[PDB]
C-alpha cells in the first residue's frame, strides 16, 4: 500500500509536469526566485518554500514515508502561493487550476 501509493504519487507529479497543464503549472516547476524584483519580502512571509522539482527530488530520494507526506508538500506549495499573493493575483488562479488536478488525482487514488 505505502509502496503502491507513492508510485501513484509519482504519476500525479508527472501529470502536473505535463504539457497538458503547462499553461498554469509553470510557475510551480522550480523554486520561487527570491532574488527577482518584487520578491524581496518572500522569505519574510514564506518560512517553508516548496515547488514541484523539490518534490520530485524528494520522491526520488525516498524522503516521503507515505502518500500523506507527499500530499502535505504539494499542498504546502499551494498554500505558500495563497499566503504570499493577493487573492486576485493571476498566479493564484493558476495555483487553483493546478490544485484542481492534484486534488482530483490524489482523491481517486485506490485504497
Amino acid at each position: 500500500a505505502g509502496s503502491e501509493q507513492l508510485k501513484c504519487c509519482s504519476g500525479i507529479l508527472k501529470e502536473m509536469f505535463a504539457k497538458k497543464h503547462a499553461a498554469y503549472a509553470w510557475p510551480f516547476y522550480k523554486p520561487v526566485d527570491v532574488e527577482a524584483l518584487g520578491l524581496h519580502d518572500y522569505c519574510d512571509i514564506i518560512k517553508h518554500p516548496m515547488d514541484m522539482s523539490t518534490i520530485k527530488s524528494k520522491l526520488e530520494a525516498r524522503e516521503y514515508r507515505d502518500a500523506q507526506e507527499f500530499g502535505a508538500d504539494v499542498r504546502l506549495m499551494f498554500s505558500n502561493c495563497y499566503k504570499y499573493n493577493p487573492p486576485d493575483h493571476e498566479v493564484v488562479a493558476m495555483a487553483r487550476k493546478l490544485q484542481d488536478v492534484f486534488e482530483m488525482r490524489f482523491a481517486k487514488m485506490p485504497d
Binding site: 510557475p27 527577482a36 518584487g38 520578491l39 499573493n85 493577493p86 493575483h89
Partner: peptide, 5 residues
C-alpha cells in the same frame, strides 16, 4: 505583478 510573468 511579476512572478507569473
Amino acid at each position: 505583478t511579476f512572478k507569473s510573468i
